[PDB]
Design a protein around this ligand. Structure first.
Ligand code: HEC
Ligand code: HEC
Ligand SMILES: OC[C@H]1O[C@H](O[C@H]2[C@H](O)[C@@H](O)[C@H](OCCCCCC3CCCCC3)O[C@@H]2CO)[C@H](O)[C@@H](O)[C@@H]1O
Ligand SMILES: OC[C@H]1O[C@H](O[C@H]2[C@H](O)[C@@H](O)[C@H](OCCCCCC3CCCCC3)O[C@@H]2CO)[C@H](O)[C@@H](O)[C@@H]1O
Ligand SMILES: [Cl-]
Ligand SMILES: [Cl-]
Lengths: 108, 108
């Protein structure tokens, strides 16, 4: 399902405990590991002034709104280049086919 | 789409360069960061003798075959507990609603 208006008060606590380590939100606030998020809604992803992103922002692009940010926050790590390869991820279907054809024989 | 028989020879090289760092495949081979994979096809996930898994193996369970291992190898990290939370992931839809309701106000 989709976004439904919730508790800004609980959301303030979630931001402090889950986001502030890598993001500020106030206008003119500093970048950290992640970019300052002022004005994030209504602008496109990957364009904060003064911050340079991973290659994700030439592979993906959204106009942030409540719905697609809700989907994003289920698993932001999967959009970081390298996360999938870290524990053996194989982007190419043909590579997974080759690996599995081998593993079927090698593990028998 | 689904699994199609591929190149065991290319798959052998993929295993050596992408899997061997954390897995052995031979019968009686040692565990490493990950479990030995002998006999993996046809047994259920999360049951290698002598290895104790993350909580993933009480949340997820498959009978490994070519198809579901192909899906798994697109992104194994997303099944490791903690990966999603690491960069701000919020499992509960109500938490994402609360966060986003706050962020909409705080970032304006
Ligand atoms: C707490 C739940 C959050 C929220 C609401 C967001 N993050 Fe992060 N984030 C981090 C990094 C390194 C990036 C850039 C990624 C890249 O360059 O590929 C981001 C990006 C975002 C965005 C997109 C910003 C844009 O300008 O498009 C958004 C909306 C976002 N984040 C929200 C790093 C981190 C963390 C470091 C461990 C943590 C924790 C979070 N983010 C948590 C959150
Ligand atoms: C190279 C592409 C591969 C392949 C084919 C597999 N892996 Fe891994 N793996 C690792 C860990 C720590 C685990 C256990 C996770 C947990 O306890 O939650 C696994 C698990 C697997 C399985 C499931 C095994 C089972 O008994 O059900 C399979 C089929 C599998 N892997 C295949 C760790 C790593 C790595 C450490 C960085 C790397 C690299 C890989 N795995 C790569 C691969
Ligand atoms: O993988 C299967 C899914 O693919 C699509 O979902 C897309 C969505 O359509 C697509 O809009 C979404 O994009 C999210 C991009 C998030 C941008 C993150 C930015 C962060 C900072 C730097 C640049 C990137 O990615 C999803 C896949 O990861 C389909 O829409 C879904 O129906 C389908 O379930
Ligand atoms: O998230 C949306 C998707 O959900 C389902 O896909 C499931 C599959 O049905 C489901 O079979 C699959 O399970 C994979 C579990 C991999 C087990 C990994 C083990 C490794 C070692 C320790 C225990 C776990 O997880 C997928 C979701 O992550 C649906 O089937 C899909 O159609 C749908 O696109
Ligand atoms: Cl492809
Ligand atoms: Cl829920």
């Amino acid at each position: 399902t989709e976004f439904k208006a919730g508790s800004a008060k609980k959301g303030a606590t979630l931001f402090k405990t889950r986001c502030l380590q890598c993001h500020t939100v106030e206008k003119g606030g500093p970048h950290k590991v992640g970019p300052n998020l002022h004005g994030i809604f209504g602008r496109h992803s990957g364009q904060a002034e003064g911050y340079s992103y991973t290659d994700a922002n030439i592979k993906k692009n959204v106009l942030w709104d409540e719905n697609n940010m809700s989907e994003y926050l289920t698993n932001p790590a999967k959009y970081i280049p390298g996360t999938k390869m870290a524990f053996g991820g194989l982007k190419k279907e043909k590579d997974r086919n080759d690996l599995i054809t081998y593993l079927k024989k090698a593990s028998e």
